[PDB]
Design an enzyme around this catalytic site. Sequence first.
Site, PDB file in Angstrom:
ATOM      1  N   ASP A 101       0.835  -1.188   0.000  1.00 44.62           N
ATOM      2  CA  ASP A 101       0.000   0.000   0.000  1.00 44.62           C
ATOM      3  C   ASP A 101       0.877   1.247   0.000  1.00 44.62           C
ATOM      4  O   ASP A 101       1.037   1.898   1.028  1.00 44.62           O
ATOM      5  CB  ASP A 101      -0.889  -0.011   1.240  1.00 44.62           C
ATOM      6  CG  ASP A 101      -2.155   0.798   1.066  1.00 44.62           C
ATOM      7  OD1 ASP A 101      -2.306   1.487   0.030  1.00 44.62           O
ATOM      8  OD2 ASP A 101      -3.021   0.717   1.969  1.00 44.62           O
ATOM      9  N   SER A 147      -5.909   7.660   5.774  1.00 42.31           N
ATOM     10  CA  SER A 147      -5.136   6.823   4.870  1.00 42.31           C
ATOM     11  C   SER A 147      -4.214   7.631   3.986  1.00 42.31           C
ATOM     12  O   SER A 147      -4.549   8.748   3.573  1.00 42.31           O
ATOM     13  CB  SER A 147      -6.050   5.976   3.988  1.00 42.31           C
ATOM     14  OG  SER A 147      -6.633   4.912   4.716  1.00 42.31           O
TER      15      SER A 147
HETATM   16  C1  LIG Z   1     -13.102  -1.234   1.822  1.00 42.15           C
HETATM   17  C2  LIG Z   1     -13.986  -2.003   2.845  1.00 42.15           C
HETATM   18  C3  LIG Z   1     -13.798  -3.535   2.686  1.00 42.15           C
HETATM   19  C4  LIG Z   1     -13.640  -1.567   4.284  1.00 42.15           C
HETATM   20  C5  LIG Z   1     -12.551  -2.129   4.966  1.00 42.15           C
HETATM   21  C6  LIG Z   1     -12.218  -1.742   6.279  1.00 42.15           C
HETATM   22  C7  LIG Z   1     -10.988  -2.434   6.935  1.00 42.15           C
HETATM   23  C8  LIG Z   1     -11.415  -3.845   7.405  1.00 42.15           C
HETATM   24  C9  LIG Z   1      -9.703  -2.556   6.054  1.00 42.15           C
HETATM   25  C10 LIG Z   1     -12.999  -0.757   6.943  1.00 42.15           C
HETATM   26  S1  LIG Z   1     -12.524  -0.278   8.644  1.00 42.15           S
HETATM   27  O1  LIG Z   1     -13.378   0.736   9.230  1.00 42.15           O
HETATM   28  O2  LIG Z   1     -12.294  -1.460   9.460  1.00 42.15           O
HETATM   29  N1  LIG Z   1     -11.080   0.422   8.327  1.00 42.15           N
HETATM   30  C11 LIG Z   1     -10.938   1.446   7.306  1.00 42.15           C
HETATM   31  C12 LIG Z   1     -10.620   2.793   7.999  1.00 42.15           C
HETATM   32  C13 LIG Z   1      -8.952   2.882   8.765  1.00 42.15           C
HETATM   33  C14 LIG Z   1      -7.937   3.248   7.876  1.00 42.15           C
HETATM   34  C15 LIG Z   1      -6.620   3.348   8.301  1.00 42.15           C
HETATM   35  C16 LIG Z   1      -6.299   3.081   9.643  1.00 42.15           C
HETATM   36  C17 LIG Z   1      -7.295   2.705  10.600  1.00 42.15           C
HETATM   37  C18 LIG Z   1      -6.958   2.444  11.951  1.00 42.15           C
HETATM   38  N2  LIG Z   1      -7.575   1.631  12.758  1.00 42.15           N
HETATM   39  N3  LIG Z   1      -6.004   3.006  12.515  1.00 42.15           N
HETATM   40  C19 LIG Z   1      -8.637   2.614  10.109  1.00 42.15           C
HETATM   41  C20 LIG Z   1      -9.852   1.064   6.297  1.00 42.15           C
HETATM   42  O3  LIG Z   1      -8.894   0.452   6.779  1.00 42.15           O
HETATM   43  N4  LIG Z   1      -9.912   1.364   4.943  1.00 42.15           N
HETATM   44  C21 LIG Z   1      -8.804   0.951   4.071  1.00 42.15           C
HETATM   45  C22 LIG Z   1      -9.464   0.139   2.935  1.00 42.15           C
HETATM   46  N5  LIG Z   1     -10.248   1.072   2.119  1.00 42.15           N
HETATM   47  C23 LIG Z   1     -10.344   0.918   0.759  1.00 42.15           C
HETATM   48  O4  LIG Z   1     -11.224   1.460   0.098  1.00 42.15           O
HETATM   49  C24 LIG Z   1      -9.374   0.066  -0.046  1.00 42.15           C
HETATM   50  C25 LIG Z   1      -9.731   0.024  -1.564  1.00 42.15           C
HETATM   51  N6  LIG Z   1      -9.057  -1.111  -2.242  1.00 42.15           N
HETATM   52  C26 LIG Z   1     -11.314   1.697   3.048  1.00 42.15           C
HETATM   53  C27 LIG Z   1     -10.847   2.383   4.179  1.00 42.15           C
HETATM   54  C28 LIG Z   1     -14.114  -0.174   6.264  1.00 42.15           C
HETATM   55  C29 LIG Z   1     -15.049   0.918   6.876  1.00 42.15           C
HETATM   56  C30 LIG Z   1     -15.961   1.671   5.860  1.00 42.15           C
HETATM   57  C31 LIG Z   1     -15.927   0.264   7.980  1.00 42.15           C
HETATM   58  C32 LIG Z   1     -14.406  -0.595   4.949  1.00 42.15           C
END
Ligand SMILES: CC(C)c1cc(C(C)C)c(S(=O)(=O)N[C@@H](Cc2cccc(C(=N)N)c2)C(=O)N2CCN(C(=O)CCN)CC2)c(C(C)C)c1
Length: 247
Positions: free
Chosen positions: A97, A198
Amino acid sequence: IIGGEFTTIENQPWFAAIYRRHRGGSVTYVCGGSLISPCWVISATHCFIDYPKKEDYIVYLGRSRLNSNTQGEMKFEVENLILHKDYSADTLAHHNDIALLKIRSKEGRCAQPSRTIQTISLPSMYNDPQFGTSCEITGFGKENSTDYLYPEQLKMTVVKLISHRECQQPHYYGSEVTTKMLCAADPQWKTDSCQGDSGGPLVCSLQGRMTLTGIVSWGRGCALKDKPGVYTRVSHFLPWIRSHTKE
Ligand SMILES: CC(C)c1cc(C(C)C)c(S(=O)(=O)N[C@@H](Cc2cccc(C(=N)N)c2)C(=O)N2CCN(C(=O)CCN)CC2)c(C(C)C)c1
């Protein structure tokens, strides 16, 4: 950024704010970034993978606010968008990434150094801060997972680096986290980066010098107990970084 404190770009001079243009006039915020050279900003590939068009992006430097101007801020176009060829996304983990954005103003110039626009240093080959060291992260990301809007004022916080052994634990991230990744979290799980931060910097004071140790990549939820923020280990991507910045 969940928790933490509000701040200005004078304190985070290397912070880049990346927006995406839209059909019409709307310009939504995409991800953060870090100025590593006058003409280069490093971020996360996952932020752009779905929209590879470099023309849809706008990079801001010396900007403290989401939807408003800041005196001394600079607006840039993306001359070249470089995404890592081996990028992949599993259940939670986001591999390779990392991304590079060659920027350029309308005049064709690069980022002119100022009090609000400075470049942050890169780490030496494999030289990272010892685990348990405090590092900072900056961003315009959500303050709570329940929020659907980003904070207008730039936020920041301090987190502690977590060993690959602790993060590789069953209740943590298991084998999902690799050696090309770093874990950082608040020992009390009160503060953390979240959706929106991010592509932003995880800066550590390495040997009396501010270094770009990592890039906000992924994490389970935001500030959940035993769910540290995972960062792209900038120290293992130096070759890739150098080969793509040369020419
Ligand atoms: C894309 C989708 C499957 C999706 C995946 C995930 C994770 C399991 C990776 C989430 S999370 O809250 O748990 N996590 C989000 C937000 C995040 C970002 C960076 C650091 C942290 C941290 N704890 N310090 C949290 C995230 O990882 N991401 C990175 C991945 N991203 C992408 O769009 C990647 C596109 N290929 C979304 C934001 C979401 C939220 C909308 C609920 C949606």
